[PDB]
Write a protein that binds this ligand. Structure first.
Ligand code: HEM
Ligand code: NA
Length: 248
């Protein structure tokens, strides 16, 4: 239901060049997971009823970074500032979604379609809209479904974003990678979810909720069995997420 806005040729040129520089920067710095977190976690403040929040660069604001659920994201914002300064024409909104798209690509993930044109919004959304790692399927549906307007399929596919990276005890309080290959985007997050708790690896209560739900569970099984089907559903979900409140 998207109608993407027109941007100038010079805008499109900056996106292409930013995309390449982001690949190099993110690969070298080994920060694909934190970048994916910044893009996705920050898009997830969207509330469809009121058309507030969402992927509009408000996460740059010290006020939104201060939200306890955003512990560590100030690192991400700080890391990107010098590169962003090379592309003054790009909104921060687009730049952070581009960094998320690139984070998935450089780690071996699918090519998520990207459309420019998000505008930087003045006011952060209220604290507390983010998914709670201690809660379950009802909470996931409240947040991704009722607020964001995403599907049950989207929920499971997006949870697979945890196939890269780790929790940190000084950030959320949780600790460790979800997989044995935390810089590799693949279906191992679902493989690990099915095989039970392996020593050294993390499952959040939000991750575990996927196994006990009658709708979520077939999706976990499908993705564990079929990485291509994961990659397809994932690219679809991530595009939608990055586009919440944008072009409709
Ligand atoms: C489903 C609801 C979600 C919950 C409850 C959740 C919760 C969390 C928590 C608690 C952390 C750890 C923060 C830390 O201690 O460093 C984390 C990290 C992460 N999240 Fe999520 N998240 C969710 C959705 C998503 C989505 C939709 C994506 C992107 C598709 C995503 C991508 C990531 C990545 C890549 C990391 C690792 C960051 C790093 O390595 O520093 N998450 N998540
Ligand atoms: Na992995």
């Amino acid at each position: 239901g998207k109608s993407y806005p027109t941007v100038s040729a010079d805008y499109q040129k900056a996106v292409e060049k930013a995309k390449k520089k982001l690949r190099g920067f993110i690969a070298e710095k080994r920060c694909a997971p934190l970048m994916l977190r910044l893009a996705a976690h920050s898009a997830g403040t969207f509330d469809k009823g009121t058309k507030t929040g969402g992927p509009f660069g408000t996460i740059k604001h010290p006020a939104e970074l201060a939200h306890s659920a955003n512990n560590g994201l100030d690192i991400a914002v700080r890391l990107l500032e010098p590169l962003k300064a090379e592309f003054p024409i790009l909104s921060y909104a687009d730049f952070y979604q581009l960094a998320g798209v690139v984070a998935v690509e450089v780690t071996g993930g699918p090519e998520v379609p990207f459309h420019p044109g998000r505008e930087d919004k003045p006011e952060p959304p209220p604290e507390g809209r983010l998914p709670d790692a201690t809660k379950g399927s009802d909470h996931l549906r409240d947040v991704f479904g009722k607020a964001m307007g995403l599907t049950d399929q989207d929920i499971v596919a997006l949870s697979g974003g945890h196939t890269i990276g780790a929790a940190h005890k000084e950030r959320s309080g949780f600790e460790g990678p979800w997989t044995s290959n935390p810089l590799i985007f693949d279906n191992s997050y679902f493989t690990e979810l099915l095989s039970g708790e392996k020593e050294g690896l993390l499952q959040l209560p939000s991750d575990k909720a996927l196994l006990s739900d009658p709708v979520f569970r077939p999706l976990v099984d499908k993705y564990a069995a079929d990485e291509d089907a994961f990659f397809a559903d994932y690219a679809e979900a991530h595009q939608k997420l990055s586009e919440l409140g944008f072009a409709d």
